[PDB]
Amino acid sequence: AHIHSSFNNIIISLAISWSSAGKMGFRSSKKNTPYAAQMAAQDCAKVAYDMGLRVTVYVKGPGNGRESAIRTIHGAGIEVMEIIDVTPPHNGCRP
């Protein structure tokens, strides 16, 4: 269960299935909102629970809705076994 977030969008991939705020319907000034992340999490969890697999979290980016997505994924079907942060730059490339 990998949640890739940013300042503009939040997407979720389980592996098998994936979801995103843009796929759910939110376009601008709403993809980085608690509602859209939970909606995308529910959209992915509808197939996650109906898959025979019941997981660890790999949240990567900083954004508003990671908690909502994790809570929705735990509530629907399987439960979040462990939320291990994988947020990753020891003075690397110039931005």
CB of 77 to RNA, least distance (A): 18
Which among 60, 63, 62, 59 has a CA at the least distance from the CA of 82? 59
Q: Which of residues 54-93 bind RNA (CB under 7 A)?
A: 58, 60, 88-93
State the sign of the Cα–Cα–Cα–Cα dihedral 88, 90, 92, 95. positive
Decide if residue 6 touches RNA (CB under 7 A).
Answer: yes
Binding status of residue 4 toward RNA by CB under 7 A? yes
Three-state DSSP state, 35: helix
Q: Which residues bind RNA (CB under 7 A)?
A: 2, 4, 6-9, 11, 13, 15-18, 20-23, 27-29, 31, 58, 60, 88-95
